[PDB]
Assembly symmetry: none
C-alpha cells in the first residue's frame, strides 16, 4: 500500500507556502531537510506551535549558515559533522523524545583567504541565535574558542603551508541545539586537531591544559578532570583511545557540562566496558546497572569487532559506504560528581539500516518504550520514502548511550539530507571489503 | 603546456582499436594518454611505443575488470590507495617503463574466486605466447605456498569476520619494457594465507624460500643473513615481512625479493634497513647510503610511527594520511649479502614539492634531460589539474645502488589522464 512520506508533514507544507527565500541554496536546503525535520518533530509529539517555532528558527537563523547546497559538481565546504561532509544532522533522544540538531556554521568567507579553516563563521551564527534565548552564555565558549581553534595568524600560516594538512577535514567548531519547552539549549563542539598541528602540542595537552586553566575559576571540575587524565595516562603510550574534541553547553558556568571525547579504535565489548567504568574506577551500583544495558545494546547491534583505522576523510555524495568506524566515548566533568560520567557511541555507519532499526526496536520494547518500538521503523522509512530500504547502509551514523539517575538515555544520529520527495523531485552494500545486509 | 592526450601513438591507436565493451574502452582512454606520453618521453622508438601499447590493450586491459567508479561494484586492489588495479612506474636511472596490474576476470570476487586467487592464470595464458623467456617454475612454487587455494578461499568466505575490511589481493604481475621485449615479475601477498594456516607471514615466506633452496642452494646465504637481521630486531620490531616478488624467468637468472613494512618513518629506520643493522659496511653500501641520506633530506618525509591507513579511498577523495616506509631485500645467487631497496612512501604529500625534490636529485647526478623535463611531463599527465594542490600522484619512490649506479624509480597514479572527460 501507499506508505508514509515525510514530505506530507503539514508544518513543512504550510511553512513552504509562507517563506521568502532570496537565495536558491537556502530554498534547496529547506526542501532537502525540512520534510524529515517536520516529520521527526510531529512523531516526537511536539505541539503544532512548537513545530512551527523550531522550523522557523531553523530556516531563518540556521539555513543561511549552511553554505551552498551540497553537490559533487561544485566546490563546497567539507564538514566533519557527517561522513558525506554535509554540515547538518538531526538526532533524536529516543528516551525523552527530544529532537536535536547540529550544524557547522559556514558563511561567504568560509574556505577563502579570509577564513581558510572556517574559524570565524561561528560568531555570525551566534549573533543570530543569541537574541532568541537569554540564558545563552558565551564565557566558556570564548575560552575554548581561543585556546582550541585556529586564530587568524595561525590560519594564515597553515594556509600558506597547507601541504602540512593535505586532505584533512578542516572543521574548527559546530553548534547544536536541543529543542525543549518552547526554548532551546545551545552547545558547541570544538576540534583542536589543526591547533595541535600549528602549535606543536598534542590534542591531549591543548585540551587538558585549557580545562585546567578554566578550573582556576571553576574548581569543581577539577576532581573529574584529574580522574579522567589518570585513566588516560594508565592506558599508556600505545593506547587505542585518543582525545579528539571537546564540547560544552553555552550556558552559565555554574550549570555548563564540559565533555571530553576519546576516539577508541578498538571496536570490542571489552573496550566499551573499559571506557564505561574508566578502567574499574567507576564501579557503583548505578554504573553497573547501566553496564548491563551497554552489554545488551552491544549484543543487539552486533558491531564488526577489531581495530579500525581512521576512515577516508569523507565520502562523495551518492557513494555507498564500504567501511566500519572506530568507537567513541565522551566524559562529562560534572560540577557535583567527582567521577567523570561516560557516554558511549556505537558507531553504526556503513551497517545495514534495517538491521540496526530492528536492534533498536527490540531494545525499545525491552525498556517498555512501546510507542517508540511501534513507530520507529515506519517513521525512519518515511524520511526516505523512495529508497530501497532493505539495502540502506548509511542512515544510522551512530547511537549514543548514557545512564543517569537510573534512566537509560539512548539517542540516534541520522543522515539528514535529500529527504521526503527529493529523490523523485547494482546493490553496492554487499560488495567491497565489508558486507552489509539484513 | 603539454598534454599527454596529444601523444601520437595514443591518438593513432584510438583510431584503430576494436572494443567490445565500454569498460575496456574507458580503461584505454583513462590510462593510455599517460602511458603513451611516458614511453615517448623515455625515448622509446615508435615501433616499441605501438608494440607495448597494443600488447597492453589486447592482453592486459581485458584483465583489469570493470572500469573503476564509485557507483558500481568493483575489485579493490592493493596496488593503489584507490584500489585501482593498474600502475605505471618509471626507472629514472635507465629510462625503463614498467607497469603493474592485478589480474581480474569474470569470476573475481564471486563465490568461484572470492579472493581473486585464480584470475592470474588466465592473464598468464595471454602473455606466455608473446615472450619465450617467461618461466613459471618459481611462480608455481610461490603461488602454491603463499596464496589461498580453493578450499582456504571457501573457508575464509564463510568466516568473513577473519577478513573484515582487509584488501584481498593475492598476486599482481609487472612488466618491464626493454629492448622490444618484456620481463615479467610477480608480487605475492601471503597475509590471508597466514590467517587460514595460522602461520605468520615471516614463517610462510622464509619457509617457502627455504623449501626452494633445496633445489637452488645459492639463495640460502643471503636468506640466512636477512633472517638473522630480522631476528635481531626482536618481537616488538617496527618492521615486519609483508610480501615477496620474483622474476618469471629461468631460475638461474631469477631474483627473489622479500619486503618489509617499516612503521617507523625516520632516517635512522631507513639507514638500519640499508645496512642490515650495521652488517653492510663496504664502500659500495656507504656510497649508496650517502645518496639515501641526500634523498631523505630533499624529500622531507613526515617522521614518526605511522598506522596502517584506511583499506582504500573512494575515487575523487584527496588523502589525509602519511604512510609507513617499505624496503625489500634481493637474494642474489652470486652474492652472499642480501641487497636492499628502500621506498620513500610519498603518497599524500604535495606532488609539486616531491617533483621539486626529484628534480634537484637529478640535477645533482648530472641527469640534465631528466631534470629539465620531469615536472613538465608529470603535469602533462594530468593537464587540467590544479597542479600545486595535488597530493596523490607520487605513490612512492624506490632507491637501490649497485655497481656504482644509483637506481631511482617513481611509482605514479595512473588513472583518468590527459583529456579525460
Amino acid at each position: 500500500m501507499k506508505a508514509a512520506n515525510a514530505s506530507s508533514a503539514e508544518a513543512y507544507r504550510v511553512l513552504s507556502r509562507a517563506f521568502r527565500f532570496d537565495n536558491e541554496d537556502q530554498k534547496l536546503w529547506w526542501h532537502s531537510t525540512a520534510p524529515m525535520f517536520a516529520k521527526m518533530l510531529e512523531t516526537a509529539n511536539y505541539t503544532t506551535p512548537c513545530q512551527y517555532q523550531y522550523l522557523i528558527t531553523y530556516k531563518e537563523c540556521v539555513i543561511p549558515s549552511l553554505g551552498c547546497y551540497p553537490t559533487n559538481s561544485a566546490p563546497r565546504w567539507l564538514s566533519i559533522l557527517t561522513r558525506y561532509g554535509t554540515p547538518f544532522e538531526l538526532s533524536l533522544n529516543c528516551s525523552n523524545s527530544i529532537v536535536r540538531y547540529t550544524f557547522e556554521p559556514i558563511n561567504q568567507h568560509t574556505g577563502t583567504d579570509k577564513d581558510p579553516f572556517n574559524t570565524h563563521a561561528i560568531w555570525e551564527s551566534l549573533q543570530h541565535l543569541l537574541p532568541l534565548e537569554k540564558s545563552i552564555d558565551l564565557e566558556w565558549f570564548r575560552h575554548f574558542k581561543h585556546d582550541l581553534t585556529l586564530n587568524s595568524e595561525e590560519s594564515a600560516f597553515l594556509a600558506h603551508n597547507d601541504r602540512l594538512v593535505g586532505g584533512t577535514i578542516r572543521t574548527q567548531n559546530k553548534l547544536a541545539l536541543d529543542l525543549k519547552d518552547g526554548r532551546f539549549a545551545l552547545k558547541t563542539y570544538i576540534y583542536p586537531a589543526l591547533k595541535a598541528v600549528v602549535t606543536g602540542k598534542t590534542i591531549h595537552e591543548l585540551v587538558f591544559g585549557s580545562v585546567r586553566r578554566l578550573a582556576v575559576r571553576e574548581p569543581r571540575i577539577l576532581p573529574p578532570l584529574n580522574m579522567l587524565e589518570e585513566y588516560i595516562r594508565s592506558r599508556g603510550s600505545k593506547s587505542t583511545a585518543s582525545p579528539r574534541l571537546v564540547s560544552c553547553d553555552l550556558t552559565s558556568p555554574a550549570k555548563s557540562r564540559i565533555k571530553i571525547y576519546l576516539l577508541e579504535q578498538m571496536v570490542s565489548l571489552e573496550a566499551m566496558e573499559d571506557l564505561w567504568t574508566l578502567g574499574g574506577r567507576r564501579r557503583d551500583a548505578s554504573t553497573l546497572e547501566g553496564l548491563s544495558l551497554v552489554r545488551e545494546l552491544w549484543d543487539l547491534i552486533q558491531l564488526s569487532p577489531g581495530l579500525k583505522s581512521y576512515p577516508a576523510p569523507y565520502l562523495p555524495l551518492g557513494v555507498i559506504p564500504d567501511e566500519r568506524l572506530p568507537l567513541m566515548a565522551n566524559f562529562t566533568l560534572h560540577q557535583n560528581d567527582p567521577v567523570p560520567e561516560p557516554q558511549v557511541y556505537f558507531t553504526t555507519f556503513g551497517m545495514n539500516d534495517m538491521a540496526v532499526a530492528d536492534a533498536l526496536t527490540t531494545f525499545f520494547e525491552r525498556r517498555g518504550w512501546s510507542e517508540m518500538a511501534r513507530t520507529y521503523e515506519t517513521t525512519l522509512k518515511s524520511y526516505y520514502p523512495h529508497a530501497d530500504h532493505d539495502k540502506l547502509n548509511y542512515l544510522h551514523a551512530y547511537i549514543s548511550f548514557s545512564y543517569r539517575d537510573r534512566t537509560p538515555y539512548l539517542s540516534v544520529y541520522l543522515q539528514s539530507f535529500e529527504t521526503g520527495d527529493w529523490a523523485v523531485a547494482p546493490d553496492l552494500s554487499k560488495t567491497g571489503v565489508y558486507y552489509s545486509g539484513l
